[PDB]
Design a protein around this ligand. Structure first.
Ligand SMILES: *[C@@H]1O[C@H](CO)[C@@H](O[C@@H]2O[C@H](CO)[C@@H](O)[C@H](O)[C@H]2NC(C)=O)[C@H](O)[C@H]1NC(C)=O
Ligand SMILES: [Mg+2]
Ligand SMILES: [Mg+2]
Lengths: 219, 222
C-alpha cells in the first residue's frame, strides 16, 4: 500500500498567522502522463464528515478560500493555511487517489492560539429527581476559557476529593476559539446526605486567583 | 448531490454490519460508490467501491469480510461487513468516488454522507435518565445564569440535545460523552442566558437517544 505520513501530529497557531502541515507518500503519486499529483487535502470538524479542500495537490475545491494553499510533487506535499481564522480549527488529512487501496494520512490536529480568557464557573447541585434514584451527580461548569489547561478540585466539607469525579472538555469553539469543561462528582445518596458544603475550585491562567463556587446541601 | 445513509448501530461480535446509502441528484450510474470508515478519535480507512455494473474493489485490509451491493433502479448501494469485532466500531461514510469518464484523474472525494456509527459490543441498549441542572438562585456578578440537562447512563452513542426545539443555540455547550467504568455513557448539555430572561423565558432541553427510542423534553426552572 502507499503509506501516507503527516507531520506534525498536532500544532497550535495564533489567529492571523501561518499553519504548515506536511504529508509524505511512501511512493510517488505523480501521474506522469497528466503531470498531476493524485493527492487530496481534507478538513474535518467534530461530528462532520471530512470537507475536501484541495485536489491535484494544489487545486482548491469550490468554496475554499485562497488562504488554503497546497504545494509539492511526487512524495512530499504541504498544506499552508495563511491568515488563520477561528473557523479553521479542525483535523487536516492528506490522501492519495493514485492507486487502490486509497490511503489517508493519520491526521494533523490544528488548535487556534488566542488571548487568555478566564472561565466563568458554575456549580449545580443534584436534582431532587436524581436523589430519588439513589445517586447524586454534582456538576461544575467552566465556560469559554483559553488555554485548555485547567485544574478542577472538588472539596466536600473542606476535604479534597479523589477518584469520584470525571471531566469532559468541548472541542475548541469555531467562533471564539475557547474551550468549556464539565467536572461531575458522583456520590451515593447516603454519602451526599452525610455532608453539607460542596465546592468546586478552579485554577486557570486567566484567573487572578483560584475561583471557588459552592452550595450548602438543602439551601 | 445529497447522500442519505442508514443502518449499522449496535451489534455483537461475529454479527454482520449492514449499511445502505441513497443518492439524490441523478447521475448515479457514472460513479464508483464508496464506503470509508473512521474509528472514534482515529483516522480514515477506505473500505471499497462498487459501480452500476456491480464491479467492486475492496481494500485487502477488509476484503475477505466485505460485500457491497448496488441497486441502480433505486440509486442505492449497500455495505456488509461480516464477523465484526471491536476493530469495526467506527463511523461509516458513504462517499461518491471516481467517474467512468476519467477514473483517478477525477478521483478526489468531494461528496460524503453524514456517517453512521457501528458499535460492536455485547452490552444492552439503555435509554438515558435526563435530570435538570437548575439555574442557581444567585447569578454571576454581571447578570449571566447557567442551566442545563444531565443525560446519564445510556448506551450506545449517539444522543442529540437541543434547547427550545432549536430556537436556543447561542451559549449552548453539549459536552462529549464520558464512557463511565460501567460501560455506560453520560453527558451534560448547558447554556448561559441573561439572569433577566429567567422570569419570562421557558428553557426546555430536547433529548433524543434514537438507539433506545428515548425522546425526552425536560423543563429546567430555578
Ligand atoms: C471506478 O474506479 C476504476 C478504478 O478502480 C475506474 O476504472 C479506470 O477508468 C480509467 C478511465 O477510463 C481507465 O483508464 C482505467 O483503465 C480504469 N482502471 C481499471 C483498473 O479499471 C473507473 O473509471 C471508475 N468509475 C466507474 C464508474 O467505474
Ligand atoms: Mg454478508
Ligand atoms: Mg421545546
Amino acid at each position: 500500500d502507499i503509506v501516507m505520513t503527516q507531520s506534525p501530529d498536532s500544532l497550535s497557531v495564533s489567529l492571523g498567522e501561518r499553519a504548515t502541515i506536511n504529508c509524505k507518500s511512501s511512493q510517488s503519486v505523480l501521474y506522469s502522463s497528466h503531470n498531476k499529483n493524485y493527492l487530496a487535502w481534507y478538513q474535518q470538524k467534530p461530528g462532520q464528515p471530512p470537507r475536501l479542500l484541495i485536489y491535484w495537490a494544489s487545486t482548491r475545491e469550490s468554496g475554499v478560500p485562497d488562504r488554503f494553499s497546497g504545494s509539492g510533487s511526487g512524495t512530499d506535499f504541504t498544506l499552508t493555511i495563511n491568515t488563520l481564522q477561528a473557523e479553521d480549527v479542525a483535523v487536516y488529512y492528506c490522501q492519495q487517489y493514485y492507486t487502490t487501496p486509497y490511503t489517508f494520512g493519520q491526521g494533523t490536529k490544528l488548535e487556534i492560539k488566542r488571548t487568555v480568557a478566564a472561565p466563568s464557573v458554575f456549580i449545580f447541585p443534584p436534582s431532587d429527581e436524581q436523589l430519588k434514584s439513589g445517586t447524586a451527580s454534582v456538576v461544575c461548569l467552566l465556560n469559554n476559557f483559553y488555554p485548555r489547561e485547567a485544574k478542577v478540585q472538588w472539596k466536600v466539607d473542606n476535604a479534597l476529593q479523589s477518584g469520584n469525579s470525571q471531566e469532559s472538555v468541548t472541542e475548541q469553539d469555531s467562533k471564539d476559539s475557547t474551550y468549556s469543561l464539565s467536572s461531575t462528582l458522583t456520590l451515593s445518596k447516603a454519602d451526599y446526605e452525610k455532608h453539607k458544603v460542596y465546592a468546586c475550585e478552579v485554577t486557570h491562567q486567566g484567573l487572578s486567583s483560584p475561583v471557588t463556587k459552592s452550595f450548602n446541601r438543602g439551601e | 448531490v445529497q447522500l442519505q445513509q442508514w443502518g449499522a448501530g449496535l451489534l455483537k461480535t461475529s454479527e454482520t454490519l449492514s449499511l445502505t446509502c441513497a443518492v439524490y441528484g441523478g447521475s448515479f450510474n457514472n460513479y464508483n460508490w464508496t464506503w470509508i470508515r473512521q474509528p472514534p478519535g482515529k483516522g480514515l480507512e477506505w473500505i471499497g467501491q462498487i459501480n452500476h455494473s456491480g464491479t467492486t474493489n475492496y481494500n485487502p485490509s477488509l476484503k475477505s469480510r466485505v460485500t457491497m451491493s448496488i441497486d441502480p433502479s433505486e440509486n442505492q448501494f449497500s455495505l456488509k461487513v461480516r464477523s465484526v469485532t471491536a476493530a469495526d466500531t467506527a463511523i461509516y461514510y458513504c462517499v461518491r468516488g471516481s467517474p467512468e469518464s476519467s477514473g483517478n484523474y477525477w478521483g478526489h472525494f468531494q461528496y460524503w454522507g453524514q456517517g453512521t456509527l457501528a458499535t460492536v459490543s455485547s452490552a444492552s441498549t439503555k435509554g438515558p435518565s435526563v435530570f435538570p441542572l437548575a439555574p442557581s438562585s444567585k447569578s454571576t456578578s454581571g447578570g449571566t445564569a447557567a442551566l442545563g440537562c444531565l443525560v446519564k447512563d445510556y448506551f450506545p452513542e449517539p444522543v442529540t440535545v437541543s434547547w427550545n426545539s432549536g430556537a436556543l443555540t447561542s451559549g449552548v455547550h453539549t459536552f462529549p460523552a464520558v464512557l463511565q467504568s460501567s460501560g455506560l455513557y453520560s453527558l451534560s448539555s448547558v447554556v448561559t442566558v441573561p439572569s433577566s430572561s429567567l422570569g419570562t423565558q421557558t428553557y426546555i432541553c430536547n433529548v433524543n437517544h434514537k438507539p433506545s427510542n428515548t425522546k425526552v423534553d425536560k423543563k429546567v426552572e430555578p
